[PDB]
């Protein structure tokens, strides 16, 4: 057929109960993740094609960048708690990978301050238990799909996007196929 298990996607041997409908993993340290988000705009292209009433979830991962990597997971938790993902995603990617001006937790916080988040507001979130459990959720989710690398996307806790089985010539055909595959899986 057009969509085939083992081609555009694979199937988890061990389906995840109660998973987000569309779940993306990434790292601000991850160069292919920079491409995915800032050049290919995979998240946004996926979102433009999702059926009505399908929420897209995006989690950060710890395993790249050591201490800073974990700081970034915690800051992404702050972004989620405060609902400012669309104000910090680009300056965090650029700060880590383009300018490389993000070298400490303080540097991460600077990005939030600059984007209009009050310091008091950031610090209270950073130190909250709501944020600690959001960090734990992201780590939990990674264990549940037995994650081995990023970027990655899982649908309904059953299917894993397999970009290596798509065409890579046209960036845009690739992006279109990726987005189309998620929609197909979403209705499966």
- Sign, CA dihedral 11-13-15-16, equals negative
Tokens describing residue 119: 């310091």
Token pair 């383009």: residue: 98
Tokens describing residue 93: 């990617």
Which residues contact residue 10 at a Cβ distance below 8 angstroms, ignoring those fewer than 6 apart? 159, 160, 162
- Experimental technique used? X-ray
User: Are β-strands 56-60 and 152-155 bridged in parallel, bridged antiparallel, or unpaired?
Assistant: unpaired
Q: Which domains does the chain have, with CATH numbers?
A: 1-188 (3.40.30.10)
**∠ CA 65-122-88 to the nearest 5 degrees?**
60
How far apart CA 37 and CA 92 sit, in angstroms, is: 11
Token pair 């708690």: residue: 81
Per-residue HEC secondary structure of the chain comes to: CCCCECCCEEECCCCCCCCCCEEEEECCCCHHHHHHHHHCCHHHHHHCCCCCCCCEEEEECCCCCHHHHHHHHHHHHHHHHHCCHHHHHHHHHHHHHHCCCCCCHHHHHHHHHHCCCCHHHHHHHHCCHHHHHHHHHHHHHHHHCCCCCCCEEEECCCEEECHHHCCCCCHHHHHHHHHHHHHHHHCC
Which residues contact residue 113 at a Cβ distance below 8 angstroms, ignoring those fewer than 6 apart? 119, 122
User: Contact at 8 Å (CB) between 82 and 125?
Assistant: yes
Tokens describing residue 40: 């290919």
Q: At how many Å resolution was this determined? A: 1.9
How far apart CA 137 and CA 110 sit, in angstroms, is: 25
Q: How far is CA 162 from the centre of its chain?
A: 16
How far apart CA 113 and CA 115 sit, in angstroms, is: 5
Q: How far is CA 79 from the centre of its chain?
A: 12
User: Contact at 8 Å (CB) between 110 and 133?
Assistant: no
How far apart CA 83 and CA 34 sit, in angstroms, is: 21
């Amino acid at each position: 057929a057009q969509y085939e298990d083992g081609k555009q996607y694979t199937t988890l041997e061990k389906p995840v109960a109660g998973a987000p409908q569309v779940l993306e993993f990434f790292s601000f340290f991850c160069p292919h993740c920079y491409q995915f988000e800032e050049v290919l705009h995979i998240s946004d292209n996926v979102k433009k094609k999702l059926p009505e009433g399908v929420k897209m979830t995006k989690y950060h991962v710890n395993f790249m960048g050591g201490d800073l990597g974990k700081d970034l997971t915690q800051a992404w938790a702050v972004a989620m708690a405060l609902g400012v993902e669309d104000k910090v995603t680009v300056p965090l990617f650029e700060g880590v990978q383009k300018t490389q001006t993000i070298r400490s937790a303080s540097d991460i916080r600077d990005v939030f301050i600059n984007a209009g988040i009050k310091g008091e507001e950031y610090d209270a979130a950073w130190n909250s238990f709501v944020v600690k459990s959001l960090v734990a959720q992201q780590e939990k989710a990674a264990a549940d799909v037995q994650l081995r690398g990023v970027p990655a996307m899982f649908v309904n806790g059953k299917y894993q996007l397999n970009p290596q089985g798509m065409d890579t010539s046209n960036m845009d055909v690739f992006v279109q196929q990726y987005a189309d595959t998620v929609k197909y899986l979403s209705e499966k």
